[PDB]
Amino acid sequence: AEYEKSQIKRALELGTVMTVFSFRKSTPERRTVQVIMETRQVAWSKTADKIEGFLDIMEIKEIRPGKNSKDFERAKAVRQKEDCCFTILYGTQFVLSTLSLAADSKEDAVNWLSGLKILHQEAMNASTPTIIESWLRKQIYSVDQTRRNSISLRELKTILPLINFKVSSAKFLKDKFVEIGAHKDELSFEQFHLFYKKLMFEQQKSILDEFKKDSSVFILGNTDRPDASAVYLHDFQRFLIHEQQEHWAQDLNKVRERMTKFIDDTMRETAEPFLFVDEFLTYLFSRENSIWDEKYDAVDMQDMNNPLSHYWISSSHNTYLTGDQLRSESSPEAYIRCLRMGCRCIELDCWDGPDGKPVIYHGWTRTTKIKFDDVVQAIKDHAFVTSSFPVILSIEEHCSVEQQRHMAKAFKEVFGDLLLTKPTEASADQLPSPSQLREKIIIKHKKLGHKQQGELYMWDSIDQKWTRHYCAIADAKLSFSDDIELHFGEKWFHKKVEKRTSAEKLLQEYCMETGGKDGTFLVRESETFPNDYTLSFWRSGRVQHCRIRSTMEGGTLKYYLTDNLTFSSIYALIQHYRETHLRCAEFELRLTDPVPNPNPHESKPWYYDSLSRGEAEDMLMRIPRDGAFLIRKREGSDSYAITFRARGKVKHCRINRDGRHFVLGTSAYFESLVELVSYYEKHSLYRKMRLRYPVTPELLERYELEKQIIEDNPLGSLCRGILDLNTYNVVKAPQGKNQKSFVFILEPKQQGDPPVEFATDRVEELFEWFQSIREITWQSIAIELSDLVVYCKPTSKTKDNLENPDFREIRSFVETKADSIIRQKPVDLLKYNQKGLTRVYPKGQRVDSSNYDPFRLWLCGSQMVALNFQTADKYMQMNHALFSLNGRTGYVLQPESMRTEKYDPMPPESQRKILMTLTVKVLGARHLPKLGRSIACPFVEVEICGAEYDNNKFKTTVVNDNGLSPIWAPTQEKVTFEIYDPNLAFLRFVVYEEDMFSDPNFLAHATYPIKAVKSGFRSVPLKNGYSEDIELASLLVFCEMRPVL
Hints:
Enzyme class: hydrolase
Subunit structure: Part of a complex composed of EEIG1, TNFRSF11A/RANK, PLCG2, GAB2, TEC and BTK; complex formation increases in the presence of TNFSF11/RANKL. Interacts (via SH2 domain) with CSF1R (tyrosine phosphorylated). Interacts constitutively with THEMIS2.
Distance between the termini: 55 Å
Radius of gyration: 33 Å
Number of strands: 46
Number of domains: 7
CATH class of the largest domain: Alpha Beta
Number of helices: 26
Strand content: 15-25%
CATH superfamily of the largest domain: Phosphatidylinositol (PI) phosphodiesterase
Helix content: 25-40%
GO molecular function: phosphatidylinositol-4,5-bisphosphate phospholipase C activity; phospholipase C activity; phosphorylation-dependent protein binding; phosphotyrosine residue binding; protein kinase binding; protein tyrosine kinase binding; scaffold protein binding
Shape: globular
CATH topology of the largest domain: TIM Barrel
Domain SH2: 492-595, 606-695
Strand order of the largest sheet: 4-3-2-1-7-6-5
Main location: membrane
């Protein structure tokens, strides 16, 4: 009841103390949990006035009831009974982050679990204008973690970059402030909203102009300013009927419902709802007007009637491995995520386990172990929640017979009714249709009728540490991969500042910029008095200086400002006067803000002063490790510059300096050079290589075939280094060099080549390794399991003999072969696919998990293409598209046309003809996400990801810095992608940032099956790579999907 719901919602907003467990942080802690309604977030606070962490309800994927995930399994859950615990899974990525909360008492938990669900339902159906408010609220909450009603102009200056908008000028912010109408430079939350609603309008006003073409009949009003002109209900209708087409509103009454829904007006109700020229623009760039047809968003029963073969069943390769196939941590959760996404074909590779029960791990790889029982419970519970249509589990068993039995028993008991033990349609000419098997698991195991890859510590000649690398032996070549993951430290100490005037200048700056408080201070060595220091501090608009005196008492050096109070260190002295008032005859003052910019970029080793541009380049070439960097004052200026070595070439990028701010390229504002180096070590400056090595003087003394090489390599794309084993003869070495005792060496026969020194933690490995290198230098299936496999049969057949298909049998072509089949003769794979199941699978080379081009296979009948799902690649994203079509079911009926007499999956160019002529023009953007530490120029590329015959790209001109409102004001664009066959195609919109050194980088992708594209101005919601959804983003586009006849 409405009364009831409100009561639950209220209970959440107040909040309850509920213990929070995570696998990290060991023992449990109790942090009050609240729903903060304006934010739409959930937050846990140690006490009050602090918000440690937030989830966003906007993005909670599941709220499972019991103590089943991680967290609770970890450590001890003695205290809390099963019913009480509730774990929430929130995330934008594949691995989903988990907040696990155990209520003290039963009643609350019921509330929460009901509660979060009540709220979550709402959010998803919140109208665009309502969301914005929350965002803006969220941002305000950002500046200071604790909730604040209003934001000072200074702070607004901090916020505008994070929103990914660059302030044109100090002037620009102020002028807008006036029209908002707060002259005290304390914009009110209500005003902030007025700001946003303006800023956005001012930048994008151009789009509105486009409509104003004669005979459009939208006849939009003057678009001069927000709140000028209006679009009232009569008019909205005429836009919804003509420009965009949506006969949903040939009827006025529903138009009104929509407009009312959008504004979320409350008051402003009653009067025939009307939209301001500003709002029209907020509607356009919003969910409500998605290019996505709603129609293809619900299971269509009519089309779920046909046989399994004719459906493109969704598929996962390895499902258990979250991430890379070599070192990934595999977890039950990995499955749960896949099935809810709506994949209907999980794989479940199984290997012999310690004590009877099978265990799942990638094979011979070092990926972790997941108990089979647990995978099984998990398949059952979450299998058919999202969708009722059938799972096609595909066990591959390396397991021994004794172990296999446990498996079979388990399958039948735990899965219970679901397992499809008996063929549904008796004799059955063709495979049962999905509807018949609805709610039923199908199992495919074979029906009865090594390479010593290990992680080895490696030693280095140069920097003196062992770096862990995974190593693989094939073709007598070890292949290796990149490495596996007091006052002197104080901001306020400025060591030797050369002149008093310099200390005064630094204080004056810091104070001018943020609004310096009395007591803002720094400490420096005294020019006048050896061994003494000088405290310099801000007071009443002027800099004051006090001598910190040193004295020796009892052999210990002591420091003092007044003769009555001696401290053991300068640190202790300063901390004291930060808490206590420094009392002089003329003032009492407490030390407040430390101003920390002496010469941080000079003490540290990685700094060359006056190094010639030429010389450094040469200096750098000598150290060859990729990712080394030298920082060099440019001659004749203030401007520091940075040179790093990558991809052989040495490239140097100019650091300008505006105020106490270093600007690498236009956008970045690192406070201090020390930072610029530090930030980029964690992140990535060029391509994907972090500055990693410092080209110190000291260190300096110390020191297409490639693609072809990549394909063969066991580690494949991942690996850096190939050493021919032939050349180097293995020796085993007693004792440990540089610790890491257990060790081996590979001395090359030729004297010159360096002695690489691979070493290991485990002796066994060493034995294994030593033997393996040394050597280089010199039917199963228990009957019960078999009975289960009623449909989908691993075929013992010559992968050559496509034809004489047997309904029950499923062939498993590996990708490489598959292309070949597809090129040698197109038609045959198709014919086999009608009335038979084929499961294409990823090649072994792909340790990385980048997925093969699904599109060809699908065109010619491949019921199941398994694309690794833990990957963000283009290809996985195309998968998430086909499967949206016809619900999250995960079956999409193959186009009727493909089935027939003469359909050629890849036909001759002359025959194909043209059917459709989509004409995207990209007009807009909004809230594109920020990637790094830079306002991100955005360029959008339309694509028609396609069968080969149709492929095209139409890149859009780059726009300078401005994330909130990038506007490609009618810059021609007007690409005319041509689609030969509509039914399988995709329209892919990707927005790529251009950063510094011009490399496209990836922000967000929209993928949409062509059938579900609606004509007229529409907004394409944008999505991160793992194709979840980023907050209010969009690219207004003007798709027209005229057919040609």
